[PDB]
C-alpha cells in the first residue's frame, strides 16, 4: 500500500525584467538673414517588465513515498493529481528523476533523515516544467493552497527460483490489484505514529465452489495484524486490541452487515460475526484508556476507585456513590484535534440517569440512561490551542450504578 | 556502499547584455517673409541588462563515487538532491555522462588523482541545464550554500553464464538491496584514513525454522 505526501510548494513566477539607461550629445548652429550656436546634452533611464498570460509561472513539489503494506514494492512509479479549487491542473507520472529503487514495508523513500525530492517537470523526458495560468496564479498569491492526490502507483515484484536469483522485471504488480481486492476485505489499524493496511481473503457465500476456508472477525484481525492472546484477548504488542478496548470505524455497507448478522448470533460480539467480501473495518486504538484491571496510561489519576469486585466488562467497576473527576494537563494533546471520550456502564437495578460535563472547547451537557447490559456512550470535545485551562470532566450520577473500559481517542 | 561527495558548485549567471552607439547629421533650411540654414551633429550611448525572473542562473556540481563495501559495482547510477535552505532545488539521476563504469571497493570515480566529474544536466538526453529561480539566486548571493544529498544508486554485478565469461546486464543490485538489509545487522568501521561498511546475517529466535 503505497501514498505519495506533499510536504511543501514552491512557485517560480515567470517575468522578463529590463533595464536602460543612455546619454545624448547634440550640436547646432543658425545663420540668419546674425549667427547662432547651439549644444545638448543629458541622459536618460528606463525600466520595463514583461508577463505572459498563458505560462505565467512554474510550481515544485516535494513529496515522500511510504508504505504500508506487507510487501516490498520495486521501481516505484506513482501518478499524482494536482488540484487548485476544483481544477485539477495535471497529472504527472513519475519520471526516471522520481522513481524509488526499493520500498520496504514500514520504510520511506527517501528514506527518514533525508530531504524530500522534487517533482517540478511534466514530460516524459524530464525537459518541460509545470506551468500554471494567470489567474491560478492570482489564486494562488490570495492565500489558496493546492492539495495533491495519488491516483495510482506503479511497481514490480519479485520472484526468487530454486538456487536464489531474485528476478523483478515483468512482475507488475498491476495485474493482481483487481482480482486481489475482489476476493478480500480490508483491514486497517491506526496505532500511534503508525499505520497497517492489510487484505483479507473472504469466502463467497453464493458459490458451492468456493472451498476457501470461512473466517470470522476476530480471527481475521488476528491472522492480519500478527496479534497474540493472553486471556482470550488480542494484543498488538503490549495495545490491547479487544473489541471493547477500540474504536470500531466502518462503513455504510459493512455496519448494515453486522447489524444484521447480529441478530441470529448468539454471543451478540462484533469479532464474531463472518467475515465477507467487500468489508471495510477501521480500528483506532485509544490515546489512552485503563480498565482498572492492569492497564492506565492517564497523565492524572481517578479521583474515586474502588475496584474491589468482580463486576464491569472483565473485573473491575471503580464506582461508588461519589463522582470521578479526571484533571488534563493539556501538555499531550494536539493544538487542533477533536477527541472522544468512551466508556461503558451498566445498570443492573433501575435508578436515576447520569449527567455527564466536559469543558474542553464548548460546555456540554447531556443525560444517559444506563440499561441491565454495558452501552457505550462515547461523547466528543476538541482543543484550542494547546495552551488552553486544564479539561476537567464529570460522571455526575448515582444510584451504585457501574462504569468499565473508559477511553479517550482522536479522530481524522 | 557507494556514496555521494560534493566538493564545490559553480553558478552562472544568465544575464543578457546590450550597448549601443549612434551618430546623427541634419540640415533644415527656411525663408521668412529672409534666409536661414541650420547644421547639426549628435551622436548617442546607450547599455542595456535583462534578466529572466523565471530562470535566472543554472548550476554546476563537481562529485565523487566512493565504495566502502565489499563488492564491485558495475555501472554505477546514483540519484542526489540539492537543498538550499528547506527546498530541494532539483533531484538528478545520473545520465550517461556520470556513470561510473567500475567502482573496486575501497576506491573512487574518478580514480584519485583526478579532477571531479561535473553534473550540469537534468534531462536524459542530457540537453538541458539546471536552472535556479531569482529568490534562489539572491539567496546564494546573501552566502548561504547548497547541499547535496544522495539517495539512492543503481548498478549492476557480474556472474558466469553458460560459455565461462563474465554478464553483467541484466544483473541489478536493486533487486538484493531490501531482501540483504531484512535479514542481516549492519556494522561500521571508522578508522583515522578510511571507513568500512559491512552487513552481517542474523538468526531470527522467533522462527523455528
Ligand atoms: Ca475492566
Given at each position: 500500500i503505497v501514498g505519495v505526501g506533499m510536504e511543501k510548494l514552491i512557485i517560480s513566477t515567470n517575468e522578463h525584467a529590463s533595464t536602460d539607461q543612455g546619454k545624448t550629445v547634440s550640436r547646432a548652429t543658425t545663420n540668419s538673414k546674425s549667427t547662432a550656436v547651439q549644444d545638448s546634452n543629458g541622459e536618460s533611464w528606463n525600466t520595463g517588465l514583461s508577463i505572459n498570460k498563458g505560462e505565467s509561472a512554474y510550481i515544485n513539489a516535494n513529496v515522500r513515498y511510504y508504505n504500508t503494506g506487507t510487501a516490498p514494492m520495486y521501481k516505484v512509479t506513482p501518478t499524482t493529481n494536482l488540484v487548485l479549487d476544483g481544477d485539477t491542473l495535471s497529472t504527472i507520472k513519475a519520471q526516471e528523476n522520481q522513481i524509488?529503487?526499493?520500498?520496504?514495508?514500514?520504510?520511506?523513500?527517501?528514506?527518514?533523515?533525508?530531504?524530500?525530492?522534487?517533482?517540478?517537470?511534466?514530460?516524459?523526458?524530464?525537459?518541460?516544467?509545470?506551468?500554471?495560468?494567470?489567474?491560478?496564479?492570482?489564486?494562488?498569491?490570495?492565500?489558496?493552497?493546492?492539495?495533491?492526490?495519488?491516483?495510482?502507483?506503479?511497481?514490480?515484484?519479485?520472484?526468487?527460483?530454486?538456487?536464489?536469483?531474485?528476478?523483478?522485471?515483468?512482475?507488475?504488480?498491476?495485474?493482481?490489484?483487481?482480482?486481489?481486492?475482489?476476493?478480500?476485505?480490508?483491514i486497517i489499524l491506526d496505532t500511534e505514529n503508525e499505520s497497517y493496511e492489510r487484505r483479507v481473503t473472504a469466502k463467497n457465500l453464493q458459490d458451492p465452489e468456493d472451498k476457501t476456508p470461512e473466517l470470522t472477525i476476530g480471527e481475521a484481525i488476528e491472522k492480519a495484524f500478527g496479534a497474540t492472546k493472553k486471556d482470550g484477548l488480542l494484543y498488538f504488542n503490549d495495545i490491547p486490541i479487544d473489541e471493547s478496548c477500540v474504536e470500531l470505524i466502518f462503513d455504510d455497507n459493512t455496519a448494515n452487515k453486522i447489524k444484521d448478522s447480529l441478530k441470529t448470533l448468539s454471543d451478540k460480539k462484533i469479532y464474531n460475526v463472518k467475515l465477507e467480501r467487500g468489508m471495510n473495518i477501521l480500528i483506532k486504538t485509544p490515546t489512552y484508556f485503563t480498565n482498572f484491571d492492569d492497564y492506565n496510561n492517564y497523565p492524572s489519576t481517578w479521583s474515586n476507585v474502588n475496584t474491589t469486585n468482580q463486576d464491569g466488562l472483565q473485573g473491575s467497576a471503580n464506582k461508588l456513590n461519589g463522582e470521578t473527576k479526571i484533571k488534563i494537563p493539556m501538555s499531550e494533546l494536539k493544538p487542533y484535534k477533536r477527541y472522544v471520550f468512551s466508556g461503558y456502564s451498566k445498570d443492573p437495578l433501575t435508578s436515576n440517569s447520569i449527567i455527564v460535563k466536559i469543558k474542553a472547547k464548548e460546555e456540554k451537557t447531556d443525560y444517559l440512561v444506563p440499561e441491565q447490559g454495558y452501552t457505550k456512550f462515547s461523547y466528543e470535545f476538541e482543543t484550542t490551542e494547546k495552551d488552553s485551562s486544564n479539561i476537567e470532566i464529570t460522571l455526575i450520577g448515582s444510584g451504585t450504578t457501574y462504569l468499565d473500559n473508559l477511553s479517550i481517542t482522536e479522530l481524522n
Amino acid at each position: 500500500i503505497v501514498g505519495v505526501g506533499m510536504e511543501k510548494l514552491i512557485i517560480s513566477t515567470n517575468e522578463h525584467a529590463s533595464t536602460d539607461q543612455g546619454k545624448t550629445v547634440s550640436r547646432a548652429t543658425t545663420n540668419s538673414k546674425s549667427t547662432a550656436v547651439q549644444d545638448s546634452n543629458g541622459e536618460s533611464w528606463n525600466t520595463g517588465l514583461s508577463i505572459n498570460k498563458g505560462e505565467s509561472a512554474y510550481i515544485n513539489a516535494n513529496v515522500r513515498y511510504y508504505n504500508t503494506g506487507t510487501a516490498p514494492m520495486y521501481k516505484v512509479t506513482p501518478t499524482t493529481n494536482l488540484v487548485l479549487d476544483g481544477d485539477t491542473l495535471s497529472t504527472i507520472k513519475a519520471q526516471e528523476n522520481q522513481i524509488g529503487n526499493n520500498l520496504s514495508p514500514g520504510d520511506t523513500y527517501p528514506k527518514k533523515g533525508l530531504s524530500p525530492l522534487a517533482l517540478n517537470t511534466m514530460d516524459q523526458f524530464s525537459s518541460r516544467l509545470i506551468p500554471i495560468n494567470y489567474d491560478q496564479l492570482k489564486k494562488l498569491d490570495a492565500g489558496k493552497q493546492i492539495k495533491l492526490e495519488t491516483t495510482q502507483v506503479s511497481g514490480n515484484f519479485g520472484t526468487k527460483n530454486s538456487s536464489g536469483q531474485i528476478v523483478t522485471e515483468g512482475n507488475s504488480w498491476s495485474d493482481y490489484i483487481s482480482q486481489i481486492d475482489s476476493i478480500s476485505a480490508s483491514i486497517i489499524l491506526d496505532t500511534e505514529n503508525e499505520s497497517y493496511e492489510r487484505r483479507v481473503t473472504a469466502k463467497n457465500l453464493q458459490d458451492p465452489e468456493d472451498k476457501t476456508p470461512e473466517l470470522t472477525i476476530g480471527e481475521a484481525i488476528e491472522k492480519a495484524f500478527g496479534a497474540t492472546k493472553k486471556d482470550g484477548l488480542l494484543y498488538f504488542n503490549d495495545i490491547p486490541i479487544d473489541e471493547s478496548c477500540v474504536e470500531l470505524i466502518f462503513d455504510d455497507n459493512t455496519a448494515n452487515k453486522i447489524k444484521d448478522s447480529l441478530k441470529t448470533l448468539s454471543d451478540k460480539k462484533i469479532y464474531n460475526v463472518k467475515l465477507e467480501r467487500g468489508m471495510n473495518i477501521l480500528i483506532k486504538t485509544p490515546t489512552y484508556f485503563t480498565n482498572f484491571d492492569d492497564y492506565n496510561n492517564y497523565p492524572s489519576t481517578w479521583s474515586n476507585v474502588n475496584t474491589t469486585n468482580q463486576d464491569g466488562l472483565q473485573g473491575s467497576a471503580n464506582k461508588l456513590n461519589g463522582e470521578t473527576k479526571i484533571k488534563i494537563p493539556m501538555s499531550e494533546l494536539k493544538p487542533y484535534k477533536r477527541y472522544v471520550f468512551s466508556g461503558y456502564s451498566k445498570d443492573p437495578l433501575t435508578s436515576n440517569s447520569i449527567i455527564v460535563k466536559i469543558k474542553a472547547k464548548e460546555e456540554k451537557t447531556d443525560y444517559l440512561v444506563p440499561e441491565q447490559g454495558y452501552t457505550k456512550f462515547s461523547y466528543e470535545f476538541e482543543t484550542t490551542e494547546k495552551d488552553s485551562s486544564n479539561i476537567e470532566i464529570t460522571l455526575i450520577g448515582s444510584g451504585t450504578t457501574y462504569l468499565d473500559n473508559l477511553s479517550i481517542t482522536e479522530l481524522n
